[PDB]
Structure formats: structure tokens, C-alpha cells
């Protein structure tokens, strides 16, 4: 019911990625319904998705569709790789790094979707912090403050080539193991 109710919209927007859209629709539906991974014995609200594949604009509008459907809000545009535009490089935030931006956005918006572009090109520190947040359920900012993840939808755009383990570099294997789901976008 939930699966299709968001699946037909995802198909409407990204119809060239029907199989991947169906897979992530199922995963998001069971995660929100509670049939997903658990942070140990206790249930967790945070959902981490890995969206591989070379289709970037399709991926972006696709997560936008999920944001507008399940939560009725716009996505938050955090990038980590060599994709910076005139919007992400915000000098208004002042003394905030990428991890600081992620932590501040999570704190201010505990109920939304988070799109992390190019996790492959992210710094080692950022990936380690993401692993720590996925393990402990709390993300640490640059100043040591701990912030609860709430149930924030987390989607990270990689570019390796359902995600096969053979196409993932060894350094990212643990992230794929710990992540709730991995989806490979078709070319």
C-alpha cells in the first residue's frame, strides 16, 4: 500500500529507473513501517540509503520526489564531492565545516530527507564521522557536541560500478555493510 503509493510517483518522475525506484520504495516503506534494520535490540528511526549509479539529475529529482511525497517538504542540498555550486559554499554559516553543516541541518530539521552527494569523494574525517553516527545513532559536530539523528532520511550519492559488492572499493565496504540499504541506479 505505502510502497505503491510512493512508487507510482517515483516512476512518474524518474521513469528511466523503475527497478531501482521499486527497490527503494519497498525499503523506505518497510523502514518507516518498522520492518527494517535495528540499532541493536532497540528500534531506530533514522534510515540510511546508498544511491549508486551515474544518473545524477535523476537521483536528485528522485530523492526530491520522496521528500515531497512522504514528508511534503523540499530536500536539503549538502554536497561533499567536487560538485560545489554557488549555493552550498555558504559563507553565511561562518565557522562550519561539512560535518558541522550536516550536524546543524540534522539538529534544526529532525524530520526531513538528507542528500549527501558524492560520498566517494568525501574526506576521510567526514566518512569516519558518518560511520560513527550510523553506529552510535548520534552525530558529533566539529566541537564535540552530540546530536540525535531523530528519524532523518539519509541518502548518500556514490558513483561505484541493487548494489553489487564487487563494484565497491574496499575502503567503503564497511559503510555498505552498515548501511540500511544500497541501491544501484541504472545508466
Amino acid at each position: 500500500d505505502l510502497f505503491k503509493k510512493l512508487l507510482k510517483g517515483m516512476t512518474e518522475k524518474v521513469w528511466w529507473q523503475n527497478d531501482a525506484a521499486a527497490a527503494v520504495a519497498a525499503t523506505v516503506s518497510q523502514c518507516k513501517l518498522g520492518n527494517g534494520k535495528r540499532r541493536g535490540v532497540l528500534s531506530k528511526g533514522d534510515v540510511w540509503l546508498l544511491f549508486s549509479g551515474p544518473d545524477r539529475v535523476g537521483k536528485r529529482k528522485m530523492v526530491s520526489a520522496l521528500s515531497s511525497l512522504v514528508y511534503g517538504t523540499n530536500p536539503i542540498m549538502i554536497q561533499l564531492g567536487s560538485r560545489q555550486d554557488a549555493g552550498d559554499g555558504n559563507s553565511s554559516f561562518r565557522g562550519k565545516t561539512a560535518l558541522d553543516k550536516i550536524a546543524e541541518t540534522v539538529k534544526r530539521s529532525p524530520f526531513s530527507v538528507i542528500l549527501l552527494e558524492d560520498i566517494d569523494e568525501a574526506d576521510m574525517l567526514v566518512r569516519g564521522s558518518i560511520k560513527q553516527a550510523m553506529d552510535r545513532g548520534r552525530i558529533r559536530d566539529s566541537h564535540g557536541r552530540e546530536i540525535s539523528l531523530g528519524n532523518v532520511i539519509f541518502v548518500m550519492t556514490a558513483s561505484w560500478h541493487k548494489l553489487s559488492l564487487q563494484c565497491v572499493p574496499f575502503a567503503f565496504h564497511d559503510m555498505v555493510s552498515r548501511v540500511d540499504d544500497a541501491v544501484a541506479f541504472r545508466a
Binding site: 532497540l42 528500534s43 531506530k44 528511526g45 554559516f93 561562518r94 565557522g95 562550519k96 529532525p110 524530520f111 548520534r138 566541537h143 564535540g144 557536541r145 552530540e146 546530536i147 540525535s148 531523530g150 528519524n151
Partner: protein, 641 residues
């Protein structure tokens, strides 16, 4: 006859009655017999010294029952380090120096500190752990709190209101040993530094493990938007598992924040303003299950509506109830014709705290005043409909008993309106809080007023305070001023000074709290044409030297972006001018050059930089504070003759 001719029993009884530490130190220098009496009858000691010279600890204080080790310099420094094999000697030294300790307060920077110091006193009854730093990483949860469980133990009271940890540590430690949890009579978990409050399951487990609790305070999350939020089931489990409860204090983590922008619904960008999973029937069952309740506090950040019937049941089912604190409880007083209802039926109340009640009107205030005729302390926050007439009539009704009044964040009640409303009890009120709001539209001796608390927005002046009505206060001794706001958008003030010289109108003023720590600005780099926090510190601290202050707690304004609360040059220079200062506590950071300014004060004795905020600086490379600087400053201060 004189004291030396009197029997020593009456002399000891007299000496035990001296509570001021300065007077006790003075009396210990009178004669040999007085020295022995004072050393034998001293009960509470707050240790003052450095970690380096801990082995120079005096052994005279053999009869102290309450020991406070949380203020050992450097503040927050690890008392015991596992990297040092001789750190185990500190435990033996403390055990030998204070063998009769029953209440202990210690800064638990490291689990080794707990494991070494706490088990030294088997007869320990009350324990308070303090930690404003990051939680050390452990393999499991609650490992550091498991070190409290001793084979020989009667810890009765546990206080974690200032001990930062994960909310899953407490249930894990309490479930490890049933005897330790069953022996607990008091449990304080009202920590505002928690990232989020306790889950429903964590609350259930904590209450299940401790069936003999008499006082219970906890920071819980009641937002239904989260998963596992505390709700009706958690409160029912609290009532069922702990029938002996006398104090129940449940509050949202945001409700405990110092900044009003965190819990005020009007100051949040649409946050809150939604019903919580708490019903009138659930509150009825909870209150029915707690016959021995004396103090109740439910400070939620989510609205609970039509709570009147529950408060009516409170009077019948809780005869011993004396204090009620309600947060975002609506319909607490909805009078019809003239019949009292809601909180107005609790005639046994002595103090009532009210926050963010939409349904409250003037008639509701009149009903509360007429029904709760025994009220001695009244506090109202965020009521948009109450006016000067209703508050004044309520104060006139409670004229015989009301001595503590707080009126904050009331739109139609400014400073002038609040002072006019408190006219009937002007000659009897002892503690008073008002908001320094001068923009509200629409015989005078405060004879017994001793404490005044003020809240003012950043950039506003203090001069109109005297003209507002707080003119003649012959007995005013302590004033607390809290300043909040974001100054990154304000311009340079047109008036040079905040107006601390206005406080010269009160001749008995000797203690001050200047809380500017909630001001957000620029610390060392402003973008362009902006003003750093040094200008605002100068604006606020000009004229502080003219006041005859003897104690001063100062909170430097913070820069949230770079996470620093440093002292600035004008602030240190102006604080140096206070010649009569005896104690000076700065809740921030300051490097050696500015700290050495304070040696010019001849009467200065107690100086400390206390980073009692979350998160405290982690090490010496994170801020401008160094352990060597603190040691040098302490040595120089103790060198002064």
C-alpha cells in the same frame, strides 16, 4: 563569665551554628580551644586548591560529612588519570583526610576517577557526579556508572543533573545490580545537556529497577513526532512502580535550557504547538497512584489541553501536595459563574509555577488567587491574555502570604505594569523577577525586597529601571541580570553604556549575577562593518567598578559558530576596577594575560574559571586556557600579603 569558662558542650553547640565559611575561618583563629572546636564541628567543606599540590592536603578536617571536590583547580581537570600509576594514591589520601564523608560531590572527568575515589567511603549516602565535558567512549553502555556499584554500599541518593552521559547508561547501570537500585531513595536525572530525553522504555526500566524511590527527577522527551517518546504508558509505569514518590519532576530537555529561544513556542520557528500523548484520564490515574506526592513538576514543550479535571483530582488524591510546576498545560483555570475549578481547587498549594497557558485570562488568575489562598510563591510565564488588573487583584487576594513573584514573557505585562501589579504586596515581597520590557503600552518602599532578577533583550538599556518603579529598595542585597539575544544583526549602540551605574540607587547591593552567556555575536572576526563581542562586553560592563560589589558571577557572551566564550580586554579591564570584590567567578575562558589583571584587587580571594556549560573545552589546544596559567595565577594570588 566568658566562653572559656563555659562547658565545652554549649561551646560546640554554638560553633556548630556558624554556617558562613568566612566566619568559621575567622573563629578558628581566635584561640586554641576555638580552633579545636571549629575543626571538630565543621560539617561541609568545598575543597579549594590545585591538582599539583593535592598531597599538601590538610588533615585537620576530620569531622566533615559533606565534601565537594568538583571545584578543584584547574576546573574540570581529571582528578585521576589512568596514565599515571600513582593516581591511586589520591584515593587513599582523600580517605585519610576526610574519613567521615557521607555526601560527596566530585567532577567525574574520567571513569578511573570514579573507580578510585568513590569506593573509598563505604558509608557514603549521597553522591553527586559532575561532567560538562564529552562522554568517554566505552565498549558497552553504562560502564562508567557501573563503577558506582560497590560490594559494600548504601548509596541512597544519586544526582546526575550535571553529569553528561548517554540516556542509555542509566538503565544499563541500574539493571546490573538489583540491590544497588533497590537501595536508592532519590534519583536526579534532570540534566539539560542530554541530546534527547529518556525513552519510554528507559523510563519504564528505571522505575522498575528502583521501587523505593522517594524523589524522582528526569529529563524526558514528550514530543510525539519522535519514536519511543514518553507518553501515557511511561507516566502510568512511573506511578505503578514507585508508589512512595514524594517529588516527581518530569521536564522536556528544551524546557530546561537557559535560553528562552529553546522552549518558548513564540520564539521557535513553528516548533511545538502540538498536542502531546498525555490525556486527562492518564493524569488522573497517575495522580491517583501517588498518594504521598508533595512536589509535582511537569514542564513539557508540547501542549496538554483540558487538564482541568486532572488538577481537580490532584487536590483530592494528593493531600500532601505543596508545590506544582506546569509547563504548557492548558485549561488549568476556566471559571464559570463563580465556581472554582482546575488548579484553583488545590487549596494546599504553597508555590505554583505556570508557563504558556493559552486559556488563562484575568478571571483565571482571580480564581487561582481566591482558591489557592495559601500560595506563597507565584510564577507565571508566557501568558498573552493576563493584564495588570487581574495580576493586581490576585496579588491583593494573596497579600498575606505572597512573598515570591515572577512575571516573565507576558505580552500585556511590561516592567512598569508588573511593578504596578505588585503594588499590594510591595511592602512584603522578598524575591522578585520582572522582564525589562519598556515598550508595553498602557509609600513606594520595597521594605522586605532582598533579591531581584531581571531579564532584558540585548541592546536595551537598564536606566529606565529606576523610573519604572523599583526606586526605593533599602534591603536589596543581590541582583541577577540575564541578557539574551543575537547581536550579529544589531548596530553599534547609540548610548555608550548599558547603565550598571543605575544600580547605585540601591545602597545595600553587594552580590551580582551578570548572565550575558546567551548573547550570540562575533568573537574575533566580524565579516565587514560589524562589531565583535568585545564592544558589547564593554557596553555592558562599563560602570561595574562604581558599585560596591563583593561577589560577582559573570557569563561572557559566546560565539556559537566557533564555540568560544572568551574574556575580552575591556571586560577584564573593567572587572579589574572592582576593588571591593571578594569572589569573582567567570563562566567562560580567559588566557593568562587577562587573568593576571585581577591581582590588582587587594581583597580578592576566590577566583575561578568555571566552564559549567555544554560542551566544556576538551583540552589546552582547544581554547586559550592552559593548566600552567591557572597554576601560576593561583600561586600568585596565594602569594599576596
Amino acid at each position: 563569665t566568658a566562653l572559656n569558662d563555659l562547658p565545652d558542650v554549649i561551646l560546640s553547640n554554638i560553633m556548630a551554628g556558624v554556617s558562613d565559611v568566612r566566619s568559621r575561618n575567622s573563629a578558628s583563629l581566635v584561640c586554641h580551644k576555638w580552633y579545636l572546636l571549629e575543626r571538630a564541628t565543621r560539617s561541609a567543606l568545598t575543597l579549594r586548591g590545585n591538582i599539583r599540590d593535592l598531597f599538601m592536603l590538610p588533615t585537620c578536617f576530620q569531622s566533615t560529612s559533606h565534601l565537594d571536590l568538583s571545584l578543584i583547580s584547574p576546573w574540570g581537570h581529571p582528578l585521576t588519570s589512568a596514565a599515571d600509576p600513582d593516581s591511586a594514591l589520591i584515593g587513599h589520601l582523600l580517605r585519610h583526610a576526610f574519613p567521615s564523608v557521607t555526601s560527596l560531590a566530585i567532577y567525574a572527568r574520567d571513569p578511573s576517577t570514579i573507580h578510585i575515589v568513590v569506593p573509598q567511603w563505604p558509608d557514603l549516602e549521597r553522591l553527586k557526579l559532575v561532567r560538562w565535558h564529552q562522554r568517554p567512549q566505552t565498549d558497552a553502555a553504562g560502564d562508567e556508572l557501573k563503577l558506582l556499584i560497590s560490594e559494600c554500599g548504601t548509596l541512597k541518593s544519586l544526582d546526575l543533573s550535571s553529569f553528561y552521559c548517554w540516556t542509555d547508561d542509566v538503565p544499563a547501570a541500574l539493571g546490573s545490580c538489583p540491590t544497588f537500585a533497590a537501595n536508592l531513595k532519590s534519583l536526579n536525572l534532570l540534566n539539560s545537556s542530554f541530546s534527547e530525553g529518556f525513552k519510554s522504555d528507559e523510563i519504564k526500566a528505571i522505575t522498575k529497577a528502583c521501587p523505593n524511590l522517594r524523589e524522582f527527577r528526569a529529563s524526558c522527551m514528550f514530543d510525539p513526532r519522535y519514536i519511543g517518546h514518553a507518553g501515557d504508558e511511561a507516566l502510568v509505569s512511573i506511578s505503578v512502580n514507585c508508589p512512595k514518590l514524594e517529588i516527581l519532576h518530569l521536564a522536556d530537555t528544551n524546557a530546561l535550557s537557559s535560553a528562552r529561544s529553546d522552549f518558548d513556542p513564540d520564539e521557535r520557528e513553528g516548533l511545538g504547538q502540538e498536542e502531546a500523548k498525555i490525556n486527562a484520564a492518564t493524569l488522573i490515574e497517575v495522580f491517583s497512584g501517588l498518594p504521598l506526592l508533595e512536589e509535582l513538576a511537569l514542564d513539557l514543550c508540547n501542549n496538554v489541553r483540558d487538564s482541568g479535571p486532572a488538577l481537580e483530582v490532584l487536590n483530592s488524591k494528593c493531600p500532601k501536595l505543596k508545590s506544582v510546576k506546569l509547563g504548557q498545560f492548558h485549561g488549568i483555570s476556566l471559571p464559570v459563574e463563580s465556581k472554582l475549578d482546575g488548579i484553583a481547587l488545590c487549596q494546599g498549594l504553597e508555590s505554583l509555577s505556570i508557563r504558556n497557558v493559552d486559556d488563562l485570562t484575568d478571571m483565571g488568575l482571580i480564581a487561582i488567587g481566591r482558591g489557592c489562598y495559601r500560595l506563597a510563591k507565584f510564577e507565571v510565564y508566557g501568558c498573552k491574555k493576563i493584564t495588570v488588573r487581574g495580576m493586581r487583584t490576585m496579588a491583593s487576594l494573596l497579600r498575606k502570604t505572597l512573598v515570591d513573584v515572577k512575571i516573565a514573557a507576558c505580552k500585556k505585562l511590561g516592567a512598569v505594569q508588573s511593578l504596578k501589579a505588585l503594588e499590594p504586596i510591595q511592602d512584603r515581597v522578598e524575591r522578585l523577577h520582572i522582564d525589562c520590557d519598556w515598550d508595553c503600552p498602557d509609600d513606594k518602599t520595597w521594605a522586605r525586597l532582598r533579591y531581584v532578577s531581571l531579564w532584558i533583550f540585548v541592546g536595551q538599556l537598564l536606566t529606565p529601571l529606576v523610573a519604572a518603579g523599583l526606586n526605593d529598595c533599602p534591603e536589596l542585597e543581590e541582583i541577577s541580570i540575564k541578557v539574551e539575544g543575537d547581536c550579529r544583526v544589531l548596530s553599534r549602540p547609540t548610548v555608550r553604556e548599558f547603565g550598571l551605574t543605575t544600580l547605585l540607587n540601591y545602597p545595600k547591593l553587594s552580590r551580582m549575577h551578570l548572565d550575558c552567556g546567551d548573547i550570540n555575536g562575533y568573537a574575533h572576526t566580524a565579516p565587514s562593518g560589524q562589531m565583535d563581542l568585545s564592544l558589547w562586553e564593554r557596553f555592558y560592563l562599563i560602570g561595574v567598578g562604581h558599585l560596591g560589589l563583593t561577589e560577582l558571577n559573570y557569563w561572557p557572551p559566546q560565539d556559537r559558530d566557533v564555540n568560544q566564550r572568551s574574556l575580552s580586554l575591556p571586560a577584564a579591564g573593567l572587572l579589574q576596577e572592582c576593588n571591593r570584590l571578594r569572589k569573582l567567578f567567570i563562566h567562560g575562558t580567559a588566557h593568562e594575560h587577562f587573568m593576571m589583571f585581577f591581582l590588582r584587587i587587594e581583597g580578592l580571594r576566590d577566583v575561578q574559571l568555571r566552564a559549567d556549560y555544554y560542551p566544556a573545552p576538551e583540552n589546552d589546544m582547544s581554547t586559550e586556557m592552559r593548566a600552567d596559567s591557572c597554576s601560576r595565577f593561583e600561586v600568585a594570588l596565594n602569594r599576596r600579603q
